[PDB]
């Protein structure tokens, strides 16, 4: 049965078992089964499976990987099956290991773009695995992102964004049919994989971005809501149904403007089931809260001032959003079991 507003029943399971003072980067839960990629700033990626009650150790390593004289930033699951996993550091090259095989490849070329990229780093893959999003730059500084498709990583689209500053953000459409394009002017831009162009372009009233719940608009990828988080500390939540007026609100209204944390935005993540939504700060500890969705409004039981949790610096819901992982800058990954 659906969650409800202002009270959760949310109870701290195990620990993940290993742990090093290295600060933890990445969070992802497996698209399926219940597997932990945890990733750290030295370059080390973990997975472990999900079961507070294994013996001997609980939530027990299923497999690491270090891949050396290479920075590790972000690491992804590919595609609904998550058979693969892509990562990046601060560096012209990625990753892509196949978990079946084993068998981990190098990718640093794309053809006819090589200049365009800065690293690799900044990446999103789309929700269906087909496709990368790389926030890339044009002969004059511009910023834009090159699509590539993943199998081939041959580039296929390209999207434009103004402000001479770049992309602070950005997220694909679940449905996969665009991307949603923070930038760094204070504009955010709706982009179309269908028409390879612009749908259009408004104003947040950012540092990080999310897009979550079921429902949304259609025409605009289906997601409900987009989270933009700034260096104030406010958190700005939009209804993406209030987007369309296809003709873009210059100016729309948040439904929410989220005032809870002073310290600058540094993580915002959605639920799988659109019920949830995180956000929090690394500059102060224990700066994370939770909301419930579509209310908006914050939950007041949890996190408590005893809940340990650190300088947050990375948060992520399992695939049925009964677990939500809180990594932070000291390498601790803990757990909670979240119950309707």
Not at 53 to 78: C, E, G, M, Q
Not at 133 to 147: H, Y
Not at 193 to 214: C, F, H, K, N, Y
């Amino acid at each position: 049965r659906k969650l409800r507003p202002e009270t959760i029943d949310i109870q701290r399971t195990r620990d993940i078992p290993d742990t090093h003072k290295a600060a933890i980067s990445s969070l992802a839960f497996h698209p399926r089964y219940p597997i932990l990629l945890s990733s750290s700033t030295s370059s080390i990626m973990y997975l472990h499976k999900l079961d507070a009650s294994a013996y001997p150790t609980p939530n027990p390593l299923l497999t690491s990987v270090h891949v050396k004289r290479t920075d590790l930033r972000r690491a992804a699951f590919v595609g609904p099956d998550g058979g693969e996993i892509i990562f990046a550091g601060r560096r012209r090259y990625f990753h892509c290991w196949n978990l079946s095989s084993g068998l981990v490849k190098k990718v640093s070329k794309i053809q006819g773009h090589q200049k365009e990229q800065r690293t690799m780093e900044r990446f999103r893959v789309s929700p269906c695995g087909r496709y990368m999003a790389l926030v890339a730059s044009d002969k004059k500084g511009g910023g834009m992102l090159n699509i590539i498709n993943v199998g081939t990583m041959q580039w296929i689209a390209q999207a434009r964004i103004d402000g001479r500053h770049g992309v602070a953000d950005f997220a694909w459409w679940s449905d996969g049919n665009g991307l949603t394009i923070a930038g760094r002017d204070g504009q955010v831009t709706e982009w179309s994989m269908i028409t390879r162009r612009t749908v259009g372009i408004w104003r947040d009233e950012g540092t990080v971005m999310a897009l979550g719940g079921r429902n949304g608009p259609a025409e605009l990828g289906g997601d409900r809501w987009v989270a933009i988080g700034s260096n104030s500390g406010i958190l700005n939540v939009y209804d993406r149904n209030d987007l369309i007026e296809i003709r873009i609100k210059k100016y729309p209204t948040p439904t929410r403007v989220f005032e809870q944390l002073t310290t600058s935005i540094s993580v915002v993540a959605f639920s799988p089931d659109g019920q949830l939504l995180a956000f929090g700060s690394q500059h102060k500890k224990d700066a994370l809260r939770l909301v419930h969705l579509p209310s908006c409004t914050v939950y007041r039981n949890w996190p408590t001032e005893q809940t340990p949790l650190g300088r947050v610096t990375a948060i992520a819901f399992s695939s049925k959003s009964d677990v939500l992982a809180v990594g932070n800058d000291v390498g601790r990954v803990r757990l909670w079991e979240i119950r309707g």
